DNA sequence: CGGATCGAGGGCCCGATAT
DNA sequence: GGGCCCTCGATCCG
């Protein structure tokens, strides 16, 4: 385990304050808002990651070694309410005025010194940095095009950073005449063994989605063995790409110090009063008069069936897998070359041929020791990149949980009554008029949004609490505006009785 | 939901005749009966179970006029099953040497139901016959048997060692999928008995009555044995709001819901064996540098907001927290089927939204939406909450039309916070991991050889329907619980072979896969990580 | 060092219920 | 009494 370090580097040149002739906010405004959004999400998520905000090309310089035109607004530290409040002072057109007043802009910088300060910022962290990452927000496709020396020194220092283990990711912004990687950023950025690059960002939603993709390093939920046969065993990593985000658990404090209180739940005897050993305890189940006694080992021994891992059963065509047989949220299977070498090759061959034949790999999934198995279907998932070339669907297998005979519940038999084609045609018109585009990120959890809005407001000890509006509620009035006559006409045709 | 079940087991000599590799139909039927009774015993459902054995050495029966229905013993009268009955099945009941008329035994079972059900005690009446049909029989009272079954409203279920279905369609592992009965084991006498069994089932439940005749093997890997005594699912009403004036009152139930352990393991003392002697006390000590005991009253509630720790008492929380607008099924909108991908499904249940019972206008109003979404290939994005206290959900509502029923299927979808975005390395163009044409043609032969589907009929037959197989957790738990109740000195028994046989794919798939697996082993290199 | 799971809390319907 | 739902606590791996 370890704490991740993330540094946000923002360009503050004249071009950054230009709304590059579109209705979207200037790249500087886009950057500041994106940074703020990441900070809040990092507070919401259960991650210890350390964040930092560094500006370059500013007249006022504030940094460790006093390099000209480098302002380190925030050092590498935990996300805070106060930090987001500081970022809010630069958000917007009103925030842009505040930025130009607090610190200058459009000053001659030196990317070599900029990366030098950033690296020196990771130097000053004491806890083990699992991943070191710098995200450069800029709209200048060829910086130091005029200065040859500054450009070569920057290329050299970028190489020194990659050799250290620091990741360099470009957040290229709207540039008149497009943004060119070949001019600059092509050699500096840290690339991948498996290759090329997302396209230039024009909307904040696109920047945030690209930022959030490389935001946190892939964290495998479990590393299991996928046994094709007793002798053919490849290693796979199970990742939870969707996981229900819940309200953080409360912390028990003290009325005066307001420091955390540790809870020690001790189990002891009634007759004696002293702490009881686990060997002296047994498990019981009483059926009527009979009492069945089992040891803790026996209660776990009965749970025992397969060893942890995935056991390939065979290949079932996707048509047989029904959409209504969902039990628990699906997982993502990706190979793990780190444990068994040659896994990725067989995994790739299996994925390609499964997609070609439109068939899923049926397995007997046992996540941990002494756990009963469950049949899962590894559905071949093809890679999808959006127009910004951000990976919307990673390539691999979706672990679809299949229910047992016990999980399928009996249904209450009702008589089939079919509607006339006129009523269906009218409902078709209603559907066609209320048609809309569904996005996975279309809605925000109102309970969480309200909880963290409340904590933010209590956190500034002055803010009244921030009322999150439930996005899950329908635009009633907009829908009534969209369909006025149709609703009453259909209501008269389908609902003729009064009641 | 109560029900009188009488299990009519053939214990005749022919049940003892065993065919090589296959457990004798007597042991097979015994395994099935034990499977049924174990579930009925440990979940403590009020259905009463009686046991009649036909082909016994002796005669213990209420119908004995003119030495009729001889060698039939009512071992257990209709009453709540207990551990003594399970112990008797396990070892006390032994196979007999005579043969009886299975229809005569059915009449004995009917007399049990007719007399022990007085006072409308049972909601459902059910008889389960376990025989091999190798015994000769008389067709004399068949017309009366059918009449008494209908007038008494008693349903039947037959269990044979071989199945009829693959008989008409044309090694051995019990509970396995596929080769679970010798095609060469049915006799002309068994065929004759089968034709009468078929006719009787059709006379009682129509054309679909034939689906209630199972083989012992498949009966072990299904829950069909409880089908007739299964308790109806609890449904609940709400209103599906498609907009103003367009809202439809519906009644939904949980279509899929993970069946979990009913009984809980109570912690007791090894000597006294009572939980009461064990007591759990909570102690508070400081989490910080110092571990001083913290007073339970002075403890105040707090929540973390990143680095800062803000004290927020439960009193203010209830007031400041998000107040849900109430339980509803309001439709947010409609989108194409392609936009909703199964990978985004969330929650731990699937809801089947049916039209409110005894409501014609709502039944048509819902049918119209179902067919409109089906014909247009569209779905409905809705907002759901079971109660005003429950947290709001956002999910998919798609049409689901079959010949008998019509309904909408709700599955919860994710919130922005729930979604997780990671970047995985591409494989389509991984220069380092791209497989050779021979490697791909080897996986091609493997997938073709290991196919779990069979498509004359030109219809696709699933050879490994997992949704029909019961969760091994339960029958394994019942096995161990009974073994400890009857043999306390002996340690826990191993997993019964039929459970492994029912969990593994059909022998034909395993045999077919042997050759391509050996070719891919050599073609696909596997090596352990050490350095 | 997070998930999955499992007690033990909480709040609405419904046959016996003293009224 | 039965189903429902939510919130912690105890159990194991990354």
Numbering used by the authors:
A (entry chain A): 33 to 227, 231 to 534
B (entry chain B): 6 to 175, 182 to 466, 469 to 544
What did the study's authors say about this model?
Nonhomologous end joining is a critical mechanism that repairs DNA double-strand breaks in human cells. Nonhomologous end joining (NHEJ) is dependent on several canonical proteins, namely, the heterodimer Ku70/80 (Ku), the large DNA-dependent protein kinase catalytic subunit (DNA-PKcs), DNA ligase IV (Lig4), x-ray repair cross-complementing protein 4 (XRCC4), and XRCC4-like factor (XLF). Following a DSB, the first NHEJ protein that binds the break site is Ku, where it rapidly recruits DNA-PKcs to form the DNA-PK complex or holoenzyme. PAXX (paralog of XRCC4 and XLF) is a more recently identified NHEJ accessory protein, which structurally resembles XRCC4 and XLF [reviewed in (11)].
(C) X-ray crystallography structure of Ku70/80, with the P-KBM bound to one of the heterodimers in the crystallographic unit to 2.97-Å resolution. The crystal structure was determined by molecular replacement to 2.97-Å resolution, and the x-ray map shows the presence of two KuΔC molecules in the asymmetric unit bound to DNA. The two DNA molecules bound to the KuΔC interact through their single-strand overhang, positioning the two Ku heterodimers at close proximity without direct protein:protein contact. Although two Ku molecules are present in the crystallographic asymmetric unit, only one is complexed with the P-KBM, and the entire 28 residues of this peptide were built into this additional electron density (residues 177 to 204). We can therefore highlight that the crystal lattices do not influence the opening and closing of Ku70. The P-KBM is engaged in a groove located between the vWA of Ku70, the core of Ku, and the C-terminal arm of Ku70. This interaction is bipartite, with two clear sites of interaction on Ku. Patch 1 is formed between the N-terminal part of the P-KBM and a groove formed between the vWA domain of Ku70 and the core of Ku. Patch 2 is mediated by the C terminus of the P-KBM and two helices of Ku70 packed against the Ku core.
